[PDB]
Amino acid sequence: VIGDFNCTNFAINDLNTTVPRISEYVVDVSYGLGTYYILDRVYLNTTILFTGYFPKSGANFRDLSLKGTTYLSTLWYQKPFLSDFNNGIFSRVKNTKLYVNKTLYSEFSTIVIGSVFINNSYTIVVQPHNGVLEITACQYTMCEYPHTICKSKGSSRNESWHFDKSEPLCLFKKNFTYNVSTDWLYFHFYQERGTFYAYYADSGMPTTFLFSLYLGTLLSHYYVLPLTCNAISSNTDNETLQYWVTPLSKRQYLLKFDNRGVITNAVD
Ligand SMILES: *[C@@H]1O[C@H](CO)[C@@H](O[C@@H]2O[C@H](CO)[C@@H](O[C@@H]3O[C@H](CO[C@H]4O[C@H](CO)[C@@H](O)[C@H](O)[C@@H]4O)[C@@H](O)[C@H](O[C@H]4O[C@H](CO)[C@@H](O)[C@H](O)[C@@H]4O)[C@@H]3O)[C@H](O)[C@H]2NC(C)=O)[C@H](O)[C@H]1NC(C)=O
Ligand SMILES: CC(=O)N[C@H]1[C@H]([C@H](O)[C@H](O)COC(C)=O)O[C@@](O[C@H](CO)[C@@H](O)[C@@H]2O[C@@](O)(C(=O)O)C[C@H](O)[C@H]2NC(C)=O)(C(=O)O)C[C@@H]1O
Ligand SMILES: *[C@@H]1O[C@H](CO)[C@@H](O[C@@H]2O[C@H](CO)[C@@H](O)[C@H](O)[C@H]2NC(C)=O)[C@H](O)[C@H]1NC(C)=O
Ligand SMILES: *[C@@H]1O[C@H](CO)[C@@H](O)[C@H](O)[C@H]1NC(C)=O
Ligand SMILES: *[C@@H]1O[C@H](CO)[C@@H](O)[C@H](O)[C@H]1NC(C)=O
Ligand SMILES: *[C@@H]1O[C@H](CO)[C@@H](O)[C@H](O)[C@H]1NC(C)=O
Ligand SMILES: *[C@@H]1O[C@H](CO)[C@@H](O)[C@H](O)[C@H]1NC(C)=O
Ligand SMILES: *[C@@H]1O[C@H](CO)[C@@H](O)[C@H](O)[C@H]1NC(C)=O
Ligand SMILES: *[C@@H]1O[C@H](CO)[C@@H](O)[C@H](O)[C@H]1NC(C)=O
Structure with a gap:
């Protein structure tokens, strides 16, 4: 279970429907993808060695996205899906693009990051709402079996x-x-000296700072919420969620900035 609150008992079962897929794709930082711009700093026409929380070059990812219909499995709310956060994660997230009429909509899995996932502890939540990314850090009363939906x-x-x-x-x-x-x-999500940090991008590029937050406590777990729809499966549209995750480590990178301040290259 994630939290401890009995939000529902509707359509819960124990079926072992899947395990996290391992990506054929691997981390390649040579053009700055998998790096981040450092906080609010601008560096112009330069190379810096910087020590930070980076993925290993050549690492795989785990796809932690879970798509449901009516049922949820109790095994979706356990290891290997409920994951130790350790230092942090880099994630690559498919923006799942859906059409209702001719109009486009964007869906992808919410991630929650926390420790015990109960309302005496802060949980960070990152959730899309069709082109708006809502982010919060709150004393949420998390459910036992949390999930989101297609809007x-x-x-x-x-x-x-x-x-x-x-x-x-x-x-x-x-x-x-x-x-x-x-x-x-x-996205990059990491913690250092009791401070959380988040970064994102919506392109194959270095991630840009979202926010930083002093917590004092260690975050220890993260989980990618199941998302339920009457869509996004092989019998209805052949479309899918994908939420790829790879662990960070305290690591030294070379970062190359052009005269605009764009990271053009990096080295592990
Ligand atoms: C912060 O987070 C905590 C932890 O999640 C929340 O505390 C829980 O709050 C819920 C809702 O009030 C509590 O659930 C209720 O507990 C009552 C007592 O449980 C005993 O008695 C029942 C029989 O009545 C036994 O079965 C049970 O084993 C216990 O021995 C129940 O009487 C309540 O029953 C009602 O709900 C159930 C389920 O929907 C129905 O079946 C009943 O008919 C009835 O409608 C209910 O179960 C829960 O116990 C709290 N846990 C703790 C550890 O405190 C906080 O509320 C939250 N705080 C904030 C500010 O949000
Ligand atoms: C994490 C995971 O395993 N995710 C897969 C999911 C679950 O394994 C399944 O939900 C059972 O989970 C539990 C906990 O029991 O199966 C999916 O595929 C289904 C067949 O497995 C799909 O075709 C559905 O088939 C129906 O017969 C039915 O009801 O399952 C009719 C329904 O209308 C239709 N759904 C539609 C059209 O969206 C799905 O989607 O649900 C693909 C998901 O990737
Ligand atoms: C952040 O984005 C969310 C999603 O668009 C906003 O949530 C809406 O807030 C209004 C407030 O009147 C509600 O009527 C809607 O029902 C909410 N929508 C959903 C899907 O929850 C939120 O207001 C935005 N701003 C902030 C600071 O959180
Ligand atoms: C959860 O709540 C539902 C609805 O009240 C109840 O039927 C069910 O027995 C509860 N289960 C547990 C484990 O508390
Ligand atoms: C969902 O919300 C509606 C409106 O409150 C309610 O009628 C319904 O019982 C809820 N549960 C499900 C499983 O639809
Ligand atoms: C679930 O199924 C997979 C694939 O057969 C297997 O590796 C795993 O051990 C099973 N059990 C659990 C609890 O994951
Ligand atoms: C960028 O740096 C190089 C190496 O020092 C230098 O040759 C070049 O003139 C610089 N250009 C600008 C616009 O700063
Ligand atoms: C939005 O994304 C598409 C696909 O990557 C791209 O073609 C388009 O130029 C982007 N537009 C903006 C405003 O970023
Ligand atoms: C999904 O893709 C497979 C392989 O191309 C095809 O056989 C099937 O008919 C497709 N179904 C839908 C709903 O597009």
Whole structure:
């Protein structure tokens, strides 16, 4: 289970439907993808050695995205999906592009990062809303079996991942835009000296700072929420979620900046 709150007992089972897929794709930082711009700094026409939380060059990813219909499995809320956060993660996220009429919509899995996932501890949540990325860090009363839904196509379950009837204490709450037409989003999430850091991009490029947050405590677990729809499967549209994740480590990178301040190259 994630949290401990009994939000539902509708259509829960114990079926071993899947395990996380391992990517054929591997981390290649030679053009800056898998690196980040350093905080609010601008570096112009230079190379720096910088020590930071980076993926290993040549590492695989685990796809932690889970697509449901009516049922959820209790085995989806355990190892290997419920994951130790350690130092942090780099993720590559497919923006799942859906059409209701001719109009386009963007869906992808929410990620939650936390420790015990109960309302005496802060949980960070990163969730898309069709071109808006909502991010929060709150004392959420997380469900036992949390999940999100398609807003675009229908869902035979309601959205249910926390049960707070009035808004919990939040250290952070902010929204960021992303290009709805992109094929991929990328994120870095890490912790250093009790401070959390987040970065994103909506292109094959170095990730840009979202926010940083002092927690004092260690985050210890992260989990990628199941998403339920009457869509996004082989018998209806052949479309899929993908939420690829690879671990970070304290690591030294060369970063090359051009005269505009764009990272053009990097080395592990
Ligand atoms: C912060 O997070 C915590 C932890 O999740 C929340 O605390 C839980 O809150 C819920 C909702 O109030 C509590 O659930 C309720 O517990 C009552 C007592 O349980 C005992 O008695 C029942 C029989 O009545 C036994 O079966 C059980 O084993 C216990 O011995 C129940 O009486 C309540 O029953 C109602 O709900 C159930 C389920 O929907 C129905 O079947 C019943 O008919 C009835 O409608 C209910 O189960 C839970 O116990 C709390 N846990 C703890 C550890 O405190 C906090 O609420 C949250 N705080 C904030 C600010 O959000
Ligand atoms: C994490 C995971 O394993 N995810 C897969 C999912 C689950 O294994 C399945 O939900 C059972 O999970 C549990 C916990 O029991 O199966 C999916 O495929 C289904 C067949 O397996 C799909 O074709 C569905 O077939 C139906 O017969 C039915 O009800 O399952 C009719 C329904 O309308 C139709 N769904 C549509 C059209 O979206 C799905 O989607 O649900 C593809 C997902 O990648
Ligand atoms: C961040 O984005 C979300 C999603 O668009 C906003 O949530 C909406 O807020 C209004 C407030 O009146 C509600 O009526 C809607 O029902 C909410 N939508 C959803 C899907 O929850 C949120 O207001 C935005 N801003 C901030 C600072 O969180
Ligand atoms: C969860 O709540 C439902 C609805 O009240 C109840 O039927 C079910 O027995 C509960 N299960 C547990 C494990 O508390
Ligand atoms: C689930 O199925 C996979 C594939 O057969 C297997 O590797 C795994 O050990 C099974 N059990 C669990 C609890 O994951
Ligand atoms: C960029 O740096 C190189 C090496 O020092 C130098 O030759 C070049 O003139 C610089 N250009 C600008 C625009 O700073
Ligand atoms: C979803 O929400 C609606 C409206 O509150 C409710 O009627 C329904 O019972 C809920 N649950 C499911 C599984 O649809
Ligand atoms: C949005 O994404 C598409 C596909 O990558 C790209 O062609 C388009 O130029 C992008 N537009 C903006 C405003 O970023
Ligand atoms: C999904 O793709 C397979 C392979 O191309 C095809 O056989 C099947 O008919 C497709 N189904 C849908 C709903 O597109």
